[PDB]
Amino acid sequence: SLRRGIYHIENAGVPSAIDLKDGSSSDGTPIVGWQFTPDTINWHQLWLAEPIPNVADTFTLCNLFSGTYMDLYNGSSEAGTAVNGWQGTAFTTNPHQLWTIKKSSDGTSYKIQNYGSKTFVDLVNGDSSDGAKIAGWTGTWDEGNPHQKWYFNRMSVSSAEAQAAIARNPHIHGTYRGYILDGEYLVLPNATFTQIWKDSGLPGSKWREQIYDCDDFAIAMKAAVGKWGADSWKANGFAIFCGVMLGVNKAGDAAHAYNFTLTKDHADIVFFEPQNGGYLNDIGYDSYMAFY
């Protein structure tokens, strides 16, 4: 089953992502194949999958940037029918915007079937061109046709996945308590995490006893990622992953505040020092408190 999340949806046949052209919020904005760069924010190519309760394996697909929904034009079962961005809502009954997503015959890629037409999201002719038409097209759940097969490359973690990542870390103090703020988190590439840090002005901040010390840097960095989240994305129903941790050294005589993020595989945490922008597998403190 596809879990609730943010996915980069990549064609199984050619290296083309599902892309809402120019990220435009206009109704009828064409959704097309476009090339992508790994370990970046592919700004027009992220999709919030929202499960519809009481309809098995069916979702809305919301462009994280535009806040508009993958829409099969007039819900036509005709092959070649336009797939566009269109205004809607996460739990809409509009079947132009409802998508049954289940594993392809290869067991790793998915097919995307319009709930109303029962036709499939097709990268027309397997065209690897930037701006290649994606359409609703006749097909079957079992065939190998790669025009209609899509890797759902997962870009978010549930809170529960975040917890699992922290609990797998060997620098957690015996007294650790974690405070969970949200349910679903876009995981940032370090390159993006670092850019948000630079854009916060924190690289310019100086350490000052109590008035601007490690707790002030850690919380400024979490607030800056929360600000960036609301200012960058028009979709709702997710947060941006950026943790705060208070830690203690081995001697038990020094406390420090810092940030953490997750690895590309989402399986482990990495510590971030907001006073120099370093990433570390070991920051020299054992976390006794985190919030994220």
Next chain:
Amino acid sequence: SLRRGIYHIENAGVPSAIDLKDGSSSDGTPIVGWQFTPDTINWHQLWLAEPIPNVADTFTLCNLFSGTYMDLYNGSSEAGTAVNGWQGTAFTTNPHQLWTIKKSSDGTSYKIQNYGSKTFVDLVNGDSSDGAKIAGWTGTWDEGNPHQKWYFNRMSVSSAEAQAAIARNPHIHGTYRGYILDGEYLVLPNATFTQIWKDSGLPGSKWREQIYDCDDFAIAMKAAVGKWGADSWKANGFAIFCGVMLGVNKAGDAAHAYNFTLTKDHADIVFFEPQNGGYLNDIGYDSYMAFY
């Protein structure tokens, strides 16, 4: 004994505070009597008292605004000697900048005696004028002379005072844990707290599911007070009081994030809702976690 803290130092005879003229960081900036407004930030009139270890009841007095020290000019024991702002350090051995502060004969006001000259901070002639000379002057620990008597009006709380304030509150959840970030906190009048909130742009922010919801507003408000702290004050060795709390309703089925501050008497907390700028004795949640 005077505790480590930030004090508004007010003459016992007339309503004049010790004021570093124009808050100037220039060496030899005159320190004078000036009128004040209660329940405001008196920007040039706050003094960080730092106890010197191994010298009983003796302190540096650092202007919170200027980051410069109360300085008896050339340490002269002559009556009429200038008291100025001067560059120095919190644990200086320069006795021009060391002050023995102990209760006056009335048991409530203090006398301020230069550790080197043994002469007293005197509001010359009890002059209530704005800009009235303050000087080192001959005197005795026991006399009633109000020119030389000073109420130390305490503006900070220790972390321990903050804890006592929270523990006195009746909206603390059974599972509550408090995470202490600093040691000494300037307590803001609501009028100032509110201004920092308005100046953060938070009144303009909209509630968005997970992407900018109550946790995002609470942490943006704490970061904005930390920013205001470093940008407003040149002294070090204190923080600005602004709490974050996560709470749960009576039903146990809803969690909310909010801020809190302290009362003017420092004895109790007040909840702040950063989504509407309201202050409340009861926000409808019992705090299970705070950091401050």
